[PDB]
Amino acid sequence: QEPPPMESPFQREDRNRFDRDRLFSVVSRGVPEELTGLLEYLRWNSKYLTDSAYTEGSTGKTCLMKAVLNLQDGVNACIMPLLQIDKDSGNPKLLVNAQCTDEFYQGHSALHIAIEKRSLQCVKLLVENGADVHLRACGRFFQKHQGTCFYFGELPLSLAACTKQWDVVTYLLENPHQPASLEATDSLGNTVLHALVMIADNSPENSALVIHMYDGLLQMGARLCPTVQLEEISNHQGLTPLKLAAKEGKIEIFRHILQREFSGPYQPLSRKFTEWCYGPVRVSLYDLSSVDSWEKNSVLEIIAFHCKSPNRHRMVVLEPLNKLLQEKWDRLVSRFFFNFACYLVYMFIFTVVAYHQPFGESMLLLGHILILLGGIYLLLGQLWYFWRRRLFIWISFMDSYFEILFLLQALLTVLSQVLRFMETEWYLPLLVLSLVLGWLNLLYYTRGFQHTGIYSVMIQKVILRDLLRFLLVYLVFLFGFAVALVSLSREPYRSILDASLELFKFTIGMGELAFQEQLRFRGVVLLLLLAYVLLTYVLLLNMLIALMSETVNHVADNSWSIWKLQKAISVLEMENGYWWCRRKKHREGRLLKVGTPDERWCFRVEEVNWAAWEKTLP
Amino acid sequence: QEPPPMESPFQREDRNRFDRDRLFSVVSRGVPEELTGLLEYLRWNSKYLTDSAYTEGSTGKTCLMKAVLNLQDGVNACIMPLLQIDKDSGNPKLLVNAQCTDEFYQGHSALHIAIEKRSLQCVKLLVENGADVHLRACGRFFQKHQGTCFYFGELPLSLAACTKQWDVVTYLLENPHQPASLEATDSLGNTVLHALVMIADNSPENSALVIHMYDGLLQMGARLCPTVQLEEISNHQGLTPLKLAAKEGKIEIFRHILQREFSGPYQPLSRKFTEWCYGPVRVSLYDLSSVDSWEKNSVLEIIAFHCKSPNRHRMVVLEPLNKLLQEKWDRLVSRFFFNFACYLVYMFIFTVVAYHQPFGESMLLLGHILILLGGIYLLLGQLWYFWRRRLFIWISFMDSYFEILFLLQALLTVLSQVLRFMETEWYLPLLVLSLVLGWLNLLYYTRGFQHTGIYSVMIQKVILRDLLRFLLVYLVFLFGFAVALVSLSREPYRSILDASLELFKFTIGMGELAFQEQLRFRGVVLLLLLAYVLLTYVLLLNMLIALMSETVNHVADNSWSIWKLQKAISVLEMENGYWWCRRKKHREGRLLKVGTPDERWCFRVEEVNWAAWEKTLP
């Protein structure tokens, strides 16, 4: 069953002396007097407007919703009578606070509607007659999900703030009857600001809208609720508006929030204090509250792992983050290169042992046991990493696969060692394959060299999504032809799989196919192989084209950000220190008294901007 | 230890009845009267403001710096009192001239600050109270280096001129107390103009800024210092502003300076006198003082060798340089082609001798000894070239490598001849390899043909930076797999290196890999080779893509400039003549009396510009 629409002059309504139809029809046109007599009716048979008589069958919709949905000049002169009449009928469960009760429009009050319909003048009459404002509307249509939806925080006030309706916010916060708790929260845990960020796209116009509303609403909350900190509240997931903009990947607001400057009044609620400027350069203390790895759930962790979005990488290059990560890198590169050298020696030993295994006895046994130890230790390390980041692989595979390969290598090598202890012979293949995997995996340390990483990422830019969408087609082209050949030469190609292998290695260039002239049906095989080759060539060509379509689009300079991001990932993970030795994280920046006394840790960055400085010059 | 910041209302200060804190705090707000009583204090305990009491712990910063750093309406009414008070305290080492003494802010006077803070009104009070203006500020932060820095010449006047502050320059040069020596110089040797050029980027706005300041300041110096030549002064490196703009690679100012025209007054300080114009064409004598190869260190030498920048090539195409180099080329192409033919005959003889060495005795011995002579002579030539240009290879490798190969060839051939005289047999391989190298090196003469060079440079445009960043990855993919195969087939692939060679020549196409079915573990080898091939193919593909991303960007017409530049390099080097015969360079252009009598050598070029001529037409 589709969800019934809220307002349809055409699809009249469902149903699951005044009857419903008459009342709806009169309030629609919006004339007052046709209502007269209604009151009497109710007193006669003791009915209440919220009863199942006049409400909708499914949604529990009422008249008021209909009235507000049918306006003229932003007003519907019929309403105030309804409130007078309800109040005079003596209704226990008030009318105005009436909400829908279906799953789609759950909690869709009238006031949400008036707010959407942009009428201050109706909001006045409504809230001036006992209305409530904390009626969270938690229906599905209001929860953000793929498809038709409208997420605004499930609250009137947040709906306005999400809809630019300034003059309504001032009201909702400056009435004597029932103001809104600016620090309110929805069922999910979000307040207004979280909605502001949840709707935002990276588009510029929406971004200016939301920045404007954010700053203005923040000043309003500083005036009306100075004691509380609207920004450091968190939802039922454990995040803040900033962290949330990071996770969901909203940027252009993330940036603004991180480096927002306000001078004179409202100074305290800023996170960028301009310390001193000199011509081109402008050194300014940035606040890093909630973006340092010291705290349990820092913005950094989220940006690196929890987030799932392409523009992620573009979030780290900016300030202050870049300077901060550069500091941590300058601090931990030594430990990094040491891990590099140690693993490299492990690989050297593994190689030597492989090349020579088939007092030398003591040396070789020592090498073997040492390989075992190194593998088990590496395995523990990667397993701790995975326990800490279980979903991460499902999030950002392209930045993690080395974290897979390390573990795979340790697994295979330890299995090989146990097999060696056993009688079986399959230990040598697993061993040598692990050796290859390890020599290869010795590219996760390509990063620090600070140019080879920029060069590599391009090696990684080659997408394999295409492989997953492609291997299927190619595998068909292959398997079918191979079945055919084996069938036709049945009475080499004796076993199917091996012939499939012939065709594969031919398509590659490694191997030479067999067109046995001896076979009675030679011409058939020749034509069939020509088909194979034509189609495989075409398919490879299309793969090449769908690869080429990447660069031509003239995209530029991503790789730098991507390298910065891989380096940040590595450093931030390493920061925890190896599991066996738990590390005591190092606070960053220092505490400075700027507020008036509000105190905020800070980090000083020296940024020079020749072009910007000249632009300012007259 | 990070450098302390100059001004921080928040990070109060270090330390390494008036105490320091009170004085700083009062001058900050900028109120005069709270200072009263200070004077008395000093007379009581004989303290001086410049003493370690009131100055900064590290930098030696003083109060005045604080005051000027904290302005209101570009003024701080507290200052003049400080000067009065100091003068009245009888201080030996004046206050105003006080500078920092740390390594970061070394010599950061107050006046530099007022100049940066754009206040003429404070500069007035400061310089009108005994201030000095030649306080070179030679700190690190002021020396141009990678990262946070601000290079302006280490002088107030040059700071203004580098910061567009006209009205301040007029003052600094037109006060009776202490004007600035327009011909001043820093510790490094630079004057103002050198700073103007050192800051300039190729951006247009900065370029207009600097051109404006250059021309205006030059007129000012022509008025105030007519006797001296501000443009022909040189620094402690031995360069002029023009030469410096060339070396560092600043262009858009280089161009303007080379062809700058001023009519009527200030005519003399111009380097382009419009001789006669006729519709489209406009012949104009250009001055080449300091851009001819006659002088010891000409602009040309610098542009060809000493400079390290991409936009170098774009500096030569322009006038007058292009016409000049074209002249020298028309003059020396004969000698060039003769060197070509002589070396070609050398190669012909070398070939013949190789093909036939294994009265013919006299002929062959003559050929052998002749090869020796030619090689030793070529070696001397290239060695003289390297002695003269030692660093050049580290500067512009892509334009030099032939200068490497010639020498390498001479070395190997002479070694081969001595070996032939000896018993050993390795002479023949070295010899034939030198023969190949020589036939190849016979492409440095591809230039003169005047179209084959334009075609070749594209052959050179293929970057090998990628090779250096790539060969590593590929070598891993290769070596690891080869180790694996040799280990697995240990109990061909017997010796590792030879198997690595198999894999390499297979990846190329030259050689055929060996998948010995006899080997017990055949399937392992097959899968492993498939991995090798997949990954090598992917890697070659990524190399191809990172190559393709060059052309698509739609860059245009560079190659012409590049050919012109290679030809200029060749001619200018040849100009010295072969070492064995020292050449007497030929002055260019002629001397013409245009000034009023200033005399300047000149070169006449006939440039036609159809489009420009029409644009001028109304």
From Swiss-Prot, chains A, B:
Family statement: Belongs to the transient receptor (TC 1.A.4) family. TrpV subfamily. TRPV2 sub-subfamily.
Cystines in this chain: none
UniProt key word Nucleotidyltransferase: no
MF-aspect GO terms: calcium channel activity; identical protein binding; monoatomic cation channel activity
GO aspect biological process, one term: positive regulation of cold-induced thermogenesis
Name of the gene encoding the protein in the UniProt record: Trpv2
Expression sites (tissue/organ): Ubiquitously expressed. Expressed in dorsal root ganglia, trigeminal ganglia, spinal cord (Lissauer's tract, dorsal horn and dorsal columns) (at protein level).
SUPFAM superfamilies: Ankyrin repeat
Function: Calcium-permeable, non-selective cation channel with an outward rectification. Seems to be regulated, at least in part, by growth factors, like IGF1, PDGF and morphogenetic neuropeptide/head activator. May transduce physical stimuli in mast cells. Activated by temperatures higher than 52 degrees Celsius; is not activated by vanilloids and acidic pH.
Name of this protein: Transient receptor potential cation channel subfamily V member 2
Record PTM text: N-glycosylated. Phosphorylated by PKA.
Ranges of the Extracellular topological domain: 412-425
Modification sites for Phosphoserine: S25
